[PDB]
């Protein structure tokens, strides 16, 4: 019979297992013999402390470096103020150590951890290439909890290298199976922040992961977007309990909070369910996301049901991980088709937005071509606008099976006049749809100002393949 | 940028 962990504080690890159902069901896992053995994550942040008395037993040198300082030893920098804290505390949440009397343990706590100390400097674009491409045949998973400034005006994502870095990975990362890239979705929900203007979290190669309070609400920190693909615990008010992890200066804390906890804790349980299948491709992983997430007992206004039977939240993308279920379906799972990719340029002249703009398309997804699509994965509407300010302007797709989209809601403090250029915005939320018949692009000025601008190019790019669907 | 999460 399994033993679950005797550490101190496994205890007041409300998230990872309990009899009220409020947890990411990680026991079961570890009841069906997946603690992570074998499987290597590395943290990209600014550091690791990598002789934590909970994180020693599991540190792997092979899954770290420091791109700051440009040596191999990603030790934080010590400072007064703790600034250095961040990538202690996400490595503690994957890979805590198990059974020691210390802190409390990870997810996946007999899998390698490491970390990568970049943000601790100048973050430029090789700097984020060099992270994301480190050891990709010996890192399995990838995790960041960082990205463009939250401030509700921003919009920016990989240049050129981190991009490259991106398409590496995926295609000849971890031995031609693809690096797993999980990011947390951002902390701009003060901001009114969208995470679709995040072209990390954005983008179709990485698990974007959004956070629940304990209670199954929305926290305050909270960014909203169709790129989000599923959902973990964190924290949300006082009264709601918190993040239990590893902290600088070999301490532990049961105060982590924001999305930085969630995109680790994705991360350990995608580490389990790799132990569970190491066959599984990049993109294999994020089809068992949206197959075994579960919305039920999570708080949000915009739940809707999508063309193929499944629930899914701008805030919360599928739901809640399952990582019993992530695990159990891993083990027999057939691995997906060869991805295609549909490009369709839907304008035939530019497009004044004016007040509202409604572009209507019926596509028929490369018919008779060798990238014809009938099973959706990711979507993404690629835009190019002028608008005199870009937060007034609200965004919305439609699916042909009527799967609404909210590709950008408005963002008050958003009051750049550049516009967007080649804009990605991506949707998960018709993944599994048949997206042949009529899209619908809305753009609509969501104030009373006498807003003015032009839409000028939009391809409609699908990706997916044309077998193997399952009953809605 | 890159800000901390
Ligand atoms: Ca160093
Ligand atoms: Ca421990
Ligand atoms: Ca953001
Ligand atoms: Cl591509
Ligand atoms: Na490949
Ligand atoms: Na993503
Ligand atoms: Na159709």
């Not at chain 1, 079961?28 to 690791?48: E, K, P, R």
């Not at chain 1, 990205?147 to 990362?173: I, N």
């Not at chain 1, 105060?255 to 995109?263: D, E, M, P, R």
């Not at chain 1, 089809?287 to 915009?302: E, F, G, I, R, Y």
Request: charged fraction near 20%.
């Amino acid at each position: 019979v399994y033993q679950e962990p005797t550490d101190p504080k496994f205890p007041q690890q409300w998230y990872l297992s309990g009899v009220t159902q409020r947890d990411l069901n990680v026991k079961a896992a570890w009841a069906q013999g997946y603690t992570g053995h074998g499987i290597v994550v590395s943290i990209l942040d600014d550091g690791i402390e990598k002789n934590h008395p909970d994180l020693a037993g599991n540190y792997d040198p092979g899954a770290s470096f420091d791109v700051n300082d440009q040596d191999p030893d990603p030790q934080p920098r010590y400072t007064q103020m703790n600034d250095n804290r961040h990538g202690t505390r996400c490595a503690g949440e994957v890979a805590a150590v198990a059974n020691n009397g210390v802190c409390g343990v990870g997810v996946a706590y007999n899998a390698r951890i490491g970390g990568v100390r970049m943000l601790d400097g100048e973050v430029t674009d090789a700097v984020e290439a060099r992270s994301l491409g480190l050891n990709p045949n010996h890192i399995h998973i990838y995790s960041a909890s960082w990205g463009p400034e939250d401030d509700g005006k921003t919009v920016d994502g990989p240049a050129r290298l981190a991009e490259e870095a991106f398409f590496r990975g995926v295609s000849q990362g971890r031995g031609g199976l693809g690096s797993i890239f999980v990011w947390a979705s951002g902390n701009g929900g003060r901001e009114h922040d969208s995470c679709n203007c995040d072209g990390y979290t954005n983008s179709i190669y990485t698990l974007s992961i959004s956070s629940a309070t304990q209670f199954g609400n929305v926290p305050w920190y909270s960014e909203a977007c169709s790129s989000t693909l599923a959902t973990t615990y964190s924290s949300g008010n006082q009264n709601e309990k918190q993040i239990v992890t590893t902290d600088l200066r070999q301490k532990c804390t049961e105060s982590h909070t924001g999305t930085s906890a969630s995109a680790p804790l994705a991360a350990g349980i995608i580490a389990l369910t790799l132990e569970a299948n190491k066959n599984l491709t990049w993109r294999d992983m994020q089809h068992l996301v949206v197959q075994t997430s579960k919305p039920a007992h999570l708080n949000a206004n915009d739940w809707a049901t999508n063309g193929v039977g499944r629930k899914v939240s701008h805030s919360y993308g599928y739901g809640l991980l399952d990582a019993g279920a992530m695990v159990a379906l891993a083990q027999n799972w057939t691995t997906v088709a060869p991805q295609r990719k549909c490009i369709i340029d839907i304008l035939t002249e530019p497009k004044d937005i004016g007040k509202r703009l409604e572009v209507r398309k019926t596509v028929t997804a490369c018919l008779g071509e060798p990238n014809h699509i009938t099973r959706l994965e990711h979507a993404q509407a690629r835009l190019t606008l002028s608008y005199n300010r870009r937060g007034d302007l609200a965004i919305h797709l439609v699916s042909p099976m009527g799967t609404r989209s909210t590709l950008l809601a408005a963002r008050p403090h958003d009051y750049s006049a550049d516009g967007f250029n080649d804009w990605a915005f991506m949707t998960t939320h018709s993944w599994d749809e048949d997206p042949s018949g009529e899209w619908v692009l809305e753009i609509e000025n969501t104030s009373e100002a006498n807003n003015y601008g032009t839409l000028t190019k939009f391809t409609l790019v699908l990706y997916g393949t044309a077998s193997g669907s399952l009953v809605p | 940028x890159x800000v901390x999460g």
